[PDB]
Design a binder for this molecule. Structure first.
Ligand code: NA
Ligand code: NA
Length: 325
């Protein structure tokens, strides 16, 4: 994808011979572009995940967040013809590219919020929810959904968690029972406008870049590429991506909730669904892991993640879905 990034440079005012540094951000290939003093960020979208109008819809939310919310987000750099999404075609399908202004914290080594910063993540998430709830979306807005069907049902976007390495007979029993309880809890919770709407859907600590390691600093939310319709509190599950099994989960939750409630109400019935959303994220990430596992080395990691998913499932089942610790 480096050659795609180079092709894309010709569409921007930054020199075509600018240096490119691959950054450790996003499932897409994202590069720090350096042209003498100038720094900027080039995102090369992976193949087949979005159509261009969907990317344009993400960028429309970013534009509204920039002007109408207190959340700091990326600023798009238009191409030389004014367009926001550059599509480039090599031989052997076309690839979409978006160019952003430099973000504090993106220069290697990339600096983001840490495990000490769940509260700040919660507060920023509440601000994203508040904006989403009041924003009148453009005509023609289009983004995909993180509903049951597209997570765990008939059209799973990251594949089946059942197919991951390490997910055998005993694990599939535990995980299916907990999944089915989660499904029933989600059906009861419903998808009314107070509970479901436009979300970032990847609000991991690593996606909030900072210009300082000490609080009171500029925090930029990056990587809106999974944004779409889903449960608002699924964003909390994403906050603990890959770390759901840590014994500190309860402390992290309390910190995140304190930050969230500083900006937006978090009612008891929503707080009571936070473990469900953690478990939803866990199954999704187990599916993602399985989709990208096909070796002995990858298998050991999937095996261990599957085992921690089962420990969480047992806690979920024994508490009737109310607790993971
Ligand atoms: Na992502
Ligand atoms: Na299996």
């Amino acid at each position: 994808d480096v050659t795609i990034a180079q092709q894309a440079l010709t569409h921007y005012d930054v020199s075509d011979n600018a240096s490119l540094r691959l950054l450790n951000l996003s499932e897409n290939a994202t590069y720090l572009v350096e042209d003498g003093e100038h720094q900027s960020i080039l995102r090369v979208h992976r193949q087949d995940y979005h159509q261009p109008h969907e990317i344009e819809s993400e960028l429309d939310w970013l534009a509204a967040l920039r002007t109408d919310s207190d959340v700091t987000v990326p600023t798009v750099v238009p191409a030389r013809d004014g367009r926001r999404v550059v599509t480039v075609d090599p031989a052997d399908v076309p690839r979409h590219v978006v160019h952003f202004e430099m973000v504090g914290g993106a220069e290697p080594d990339e600096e983001s919020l840490t495990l000490d910063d769940f509260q700040t993540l919660g507060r920023i998430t509440a601000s994203l929810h508040e904006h989403s709830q009041r924003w009148t979306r453009p005509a023609g807005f289009g983004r995909f959904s993180w509903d049951w069907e597209h997570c765990l049902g008939d059209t799973p976007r990251w594949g089946r968690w059942q197919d991951a390495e390490g997910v055998g007979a005993s694990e599939t029993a535990l995980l299916t029972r907990a999944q089915d309880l989660l499904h029933r809890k989600l059906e009861e919770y419903g998808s009314g406008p107070d509970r479901y709407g436009l979300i970032h859907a990847d609000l991991r600590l690593a996606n909030l870049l900072v210009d300082s390691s000490t609080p009171q600093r500029t925090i930029t939310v990056i990587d809106f590429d999974d944004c779409g319709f889903g449960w608002y509190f699924y964003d909390f599950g994403t906050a603990v991506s890959f770390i759901e099994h840590d014994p500190r989960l309860g402390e992290w939750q309390e910190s995140w909730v304190a930050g969230y409630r500083s900006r937006r109400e978090l009612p008891a019935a929503d707080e009571a669904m936070l473990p469900s959303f953690v478990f939803l994220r866990r199954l999704l990430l187990l599916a993602w892991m399985g989709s990208h596992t096909h070796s002995r080395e990858s298998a050991t990691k999937a095996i261990s993640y599957a085992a921690g998913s089962c420990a969480l499932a047992e806690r979920y089942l024994s508490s009737d879905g109310l607790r993971l610790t």
